[PDB]
Amino acid sequence: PLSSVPEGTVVSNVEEKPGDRGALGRTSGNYVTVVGHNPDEGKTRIKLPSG
Amino acid sequence: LGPQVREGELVFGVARIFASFNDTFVHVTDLSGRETICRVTGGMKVKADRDESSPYAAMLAAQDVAARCKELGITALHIKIRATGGNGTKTPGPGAQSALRALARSGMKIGRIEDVTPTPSDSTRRKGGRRGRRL
Amino acid sequence: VKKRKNNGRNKKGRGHVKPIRCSNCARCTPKDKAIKRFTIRNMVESAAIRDISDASVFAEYTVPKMYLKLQYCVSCAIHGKIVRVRSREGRRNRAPPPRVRYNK
Amino acid sequence: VGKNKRLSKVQDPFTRKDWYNIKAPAPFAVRDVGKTLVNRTTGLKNANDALKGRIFEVCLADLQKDEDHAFRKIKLRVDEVQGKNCLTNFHGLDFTTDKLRSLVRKWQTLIEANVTVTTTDHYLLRLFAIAFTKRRPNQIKKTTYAQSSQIRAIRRKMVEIIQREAASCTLHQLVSKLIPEVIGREIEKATQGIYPLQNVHIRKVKLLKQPKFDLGALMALHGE
Amino acid sequence: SIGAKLALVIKSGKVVLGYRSTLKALRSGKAKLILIAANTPPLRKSELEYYSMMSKTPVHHYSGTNIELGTACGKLFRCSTMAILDAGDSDILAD
Amino acid sequence: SKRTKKVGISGKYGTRYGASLRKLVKKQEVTQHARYTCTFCGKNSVRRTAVGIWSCKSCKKTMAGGAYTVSTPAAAAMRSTLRRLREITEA
RNA sequence: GGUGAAAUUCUUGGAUUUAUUGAAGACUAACAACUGCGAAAGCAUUCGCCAAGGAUGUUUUCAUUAAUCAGGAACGAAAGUUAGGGGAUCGAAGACGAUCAGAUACCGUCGUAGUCUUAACCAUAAACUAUGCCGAUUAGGGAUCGGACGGCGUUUAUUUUUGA
Ligand SMILES: [Zn+2]
Ligand SMILES: [Zn+2]
Numbered sequence A: 001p002l003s004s005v006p007e008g009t010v011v012s013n014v015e016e017k018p019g020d021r022g023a024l025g026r027t028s029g030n031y032v033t034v035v036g037h038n039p040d041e042g043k044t045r046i047k048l049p050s051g
Numbered sequence B: 001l002g003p004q005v006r007e008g009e010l011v012f013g014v015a016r017i018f019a020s021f022n023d024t025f026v027h028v029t030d031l032s033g034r035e036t037i038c039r040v041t042g043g044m045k046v047k048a049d050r051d052e053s054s055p056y057a058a059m060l061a062a063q064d065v066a067a068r069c070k071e072l073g074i075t076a077l078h079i080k081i082r083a084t085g086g087n088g089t090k091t092p093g094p095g096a097q098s099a100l101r102a103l104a105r106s107g108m109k110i111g112r113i114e115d116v117t118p119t120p121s122d123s124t125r126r127k128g129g130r131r132g133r134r135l
Numbered sequence C: 001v002k003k004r005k006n007n008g009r010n011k012k013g014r015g016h017v018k019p020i021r022c023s024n025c026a027r028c029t030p031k032d033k034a035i036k037r038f039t040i041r042n043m044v045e046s047a048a049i050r051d052i053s054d055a056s057v058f059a060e061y062t063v064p065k066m067y068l069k070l071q072y073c074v075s076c077a078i079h080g081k082i083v084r085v086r087s088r089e090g091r092r093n094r095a096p097p098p099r100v101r102y103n104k
Numbered sequence D: 001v002g003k004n005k006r007l008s009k010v011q012d013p014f015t016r017k018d019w020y021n022i023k024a025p026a027p028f029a030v031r032d033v034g035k036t037l038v039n040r041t042t043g044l045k046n047a048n049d050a051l052k053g054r055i056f057e058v059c060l061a062d063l064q065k066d067e068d069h070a071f072r073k074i075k076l077r078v079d080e081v082q083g084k085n086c087l088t089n090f091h092g093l094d095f096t097t098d099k100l101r102s103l104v105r106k107w108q109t110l111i112e113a114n115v116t117v118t119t120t121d122h123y124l125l126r127l128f129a130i131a132f133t134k135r136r137p138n139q140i141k142k143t144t145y146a147q148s149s150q151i152r153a154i155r156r157k158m159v160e161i162i163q164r165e166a167a168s169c170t171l172h173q174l175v176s177k178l179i180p181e182v183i184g185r186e187i188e189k190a191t192q193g194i195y196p197l198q199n200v201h202i203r204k205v206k207l208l209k210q211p212k213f214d215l216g217a218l219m220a221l222h223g224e
Numbered sequence E: 001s002i003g004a005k006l007a008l009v010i011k012s013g014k015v016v017l018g019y020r021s022t023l024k025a026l027r028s029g030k031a032k033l034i035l036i037a038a039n040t041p042p043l044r045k046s047e048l049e050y051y052s053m054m055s056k057t058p059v060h061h062y063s064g065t066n067i068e069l070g071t072a073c074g075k076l077f078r079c080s081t082m083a084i085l086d087a088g089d090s091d092i093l094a095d
Numbered sequence F: 001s002k003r004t005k006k007v008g009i010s011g012k013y014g015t016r017y018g019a020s021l022r023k024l025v026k027k028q029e030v031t032q033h034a035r036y037t038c039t040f041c042g043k044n045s046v047r048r049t050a051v052g053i054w055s056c057k058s059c060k061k062t063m064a065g066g067a068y069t070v071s072t073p074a075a076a077a078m079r080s081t082l083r084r085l086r087e088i089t090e091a
Numbered sequence G: 001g002g003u004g005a006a007a008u009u010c011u012u013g014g015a016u017u018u019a020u021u022g023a024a025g026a027c028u029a030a031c032a033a034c035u036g037c038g039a040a041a042g043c044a045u046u047c048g049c050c051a052a053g054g055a056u057g058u059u060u061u062c063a064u065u066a067a068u069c070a071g072g073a074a075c076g077a078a079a080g081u082u083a084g085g086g087g088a089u090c091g092a093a094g095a096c097g098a099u100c101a102g103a104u105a106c107c108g109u110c111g112u113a114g115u116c117u118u119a120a121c122c123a124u125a126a127a128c129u130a131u132g133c134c135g136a137u138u139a140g141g142g143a144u145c146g147g148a149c150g151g152c153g154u155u156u157a158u159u160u161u162u163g164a
Helices: B055-072 B094-106 C046-054 D060-064 D097-103 D148-166 D171-178 D182-190 D215-221 E002-012 E019-028 E042-055 E066-073 F008-013 F019-032 F073-090
Strands: A032-036 A045-047 B012-019 B024-029 B036-041 B076-082 B109-115 C019-021 C028-030 C035-041 C066-072 D017-021 D035-039 D055-059 D073-082 D085-090 D110-118 D124-132 D198-201 D205-209 E014-017 E033-036 E059-061 E081-086 F046-048 F053-056 F062-064
Touching: B012 B055, B012 B094, B024 B055, B024 B094, B036 B055, B055 B094, B076 B094, B094 B109, B094 C046, B109 D097, C066 D097, D017 D085, D055 D060, D060 D073, D073 D215, D085 D171, D085 D215, D110 D148, D124 D148, D124 D182, D148 D182, D171 D182, D182 D198, E002 E066, E014 E019, E019 E042, E019 E081, E033 E042, E042 E059, F008 F019
Parallel strands: B012 B076, B076 B109, E033 E059
Antiparallel strands: A032 A045, B012 B024, B024 B036, C019 C028, C035 C066, D017 D035, D055 D073, D073 D085, D110 D124, D124 D198, D124 D205, E014 E081, E033 E081, F046 F053, F053 F062
């Protein structure tokens, strides 16, 4: 789960909403990056392979 | 309206004067950067346009700062004098000398003056080029 | 004809030294071919201190003097009169100018 | 420049400002450094929300009423506010700009080191330290330089010392070590066998992460 | 350091290379030290240590690959495990 | 007996497609048909099968790699930093 | 903001200034010097790993195995070229603002290639000590870096030897 992860790690095949089974980065040689968290009212900001 | 105190104790502020080689900013606030108290610049003091960075403009600005400040109920100030810094000159502008001393002439208490010019440690390349301003 | 025996740079035994920016024009000059000036100047003049002293925050004290180090290229240096041309024999003399301790 | 501004762009906001008192932590003597400004408490905007994230710059000489330690200035962050009083605790240290430049001088050797540290209880904060070479009374040599191999030795012991006494501490007792300069004196007496190493000091302290709030401990140390 | 001690052994003492031969030697009960490479199949790794514990003979996990172990024994081929039948004048068995 | 002087593997294309494209495809073609040493068994018996799949002819293990190389510089940097990042974060 | 002085540009959708936190890339100020190392170009933050080198010491070892080199070969600042990554700051070309009779410039605000790095090319510089390499002799001095030797003292060390 993307909340149990420190900032800076690259991941792939991220779920846009919990349960949709993977939607975000899933092509050959691409990834997304986490930047920062928000423990209160839990929400996370990410950067996409397009900017 | 403004809260009072007993006669023996007084109250402190800090002024942040910004004196470059082209203008001088007089700007007083509380012991913070929050809650601006007063701020007047040379451009509303002179009209010749040749003195905007002169000590003459500085004293005129500092006077009306001191006047309006005393009614708000401040009596003493800390001073923060800063030049451009960084890749700049690090030498305080000419107006700065006049403004700080002129505060004693207005009788406002002065306490704990200091300089906070930002000095780099191995900074980037600096404006001008390889041959500098060639005039 | 050589004008200086040290070529005016004072570097013998190395390839080069990394340059530095002239504190007046921002020109680039090698670190050894530069006029360097150390300065220990007070915050303000003595005249200001008396006004400063009367409204003393704590007891009787002096605001600490500042310390500076300036570096000049040679062309700007002798336009601001930090140094000036000497004579044919006076050139080869590397002693600091003597300071009078009594000033007449 | 009145003629300028050809394209162009209730008064007196002060009517809604309020002064509040600020208080200081336990070990220091005086716990009143001045007043602070804020808009008056009203609907749509509370007053606690403006006081819950401020920090103040106060000189340690003022807080301790002793002019020997007149070259270190510290910063205090405000945490909780009761009626017209702000409770605070430590948020960092610093020297004065001018002093650091007077320490260094030509024909010497400067030695510097860095270390982060954390205690058993959660407190991440970093310590800085400096030292200088010392001349000898009957010296004629004009340089007073050490050798590289010797220079590396100094740091390893210097680094080791800071960690050893800062491992098992709390915030209060570590500050009780900073104010009498226990670190500087201990470094000198430990490095004397190899080289003098005069003028030891800790420049400043800055914190990186903090544990949970624990209002109990704040009110336990503060305000008695 | 470990490489130097091992180089001495192959000149003075005697040593046997390979998986089956060490297992036979270990089975006879006259081994004194076995070496295990880093990239060996985990099943062999766990099996080899189990025999050693039964026979009460020390085991040493070499840090290099099986290619490196071979070039340290002075041969021109890969090797995964080895057994020391007797040391020469060295002191490997000290620790 | 060198049979060429600069063309190399891209000699099958004759005089077609332009000089710069031939020279530029050589960089990937030469490293795609090569043979790399296995990591699990040690033998030098690893060859490419699909666009991103590699397999060892002797241990029968299969590994997902780059397009034209068993590994790519971007992936190697990420693994090292991530391993370093995790250890300090948990210490 | 900026200049000798103006002017572009930006602003109550709060400039500028203040405090806390985060990201990116470059660089290791002060100490730093008539001081060091390398064949030169060049090389300055800590620690770990890897290999290399001069001088010194030596009643160890081989025994002329040596010096300089036409053709031949390795390295070779900056700028420049070909593909990726990265692209904070400066900044060729270029657009605007001023000065000037003109100003395709010197002064100001931006800004592309480039300035960084990975894999390959190029082999020129006031690449300057304008001073080729090996060997012998020739005048006085005080400073300075590394090693060794001798000596009365001082300094502070679980000290004494040693360090200085
Ligand atoms: Zn200059
Ligand atoms: Zn395999």
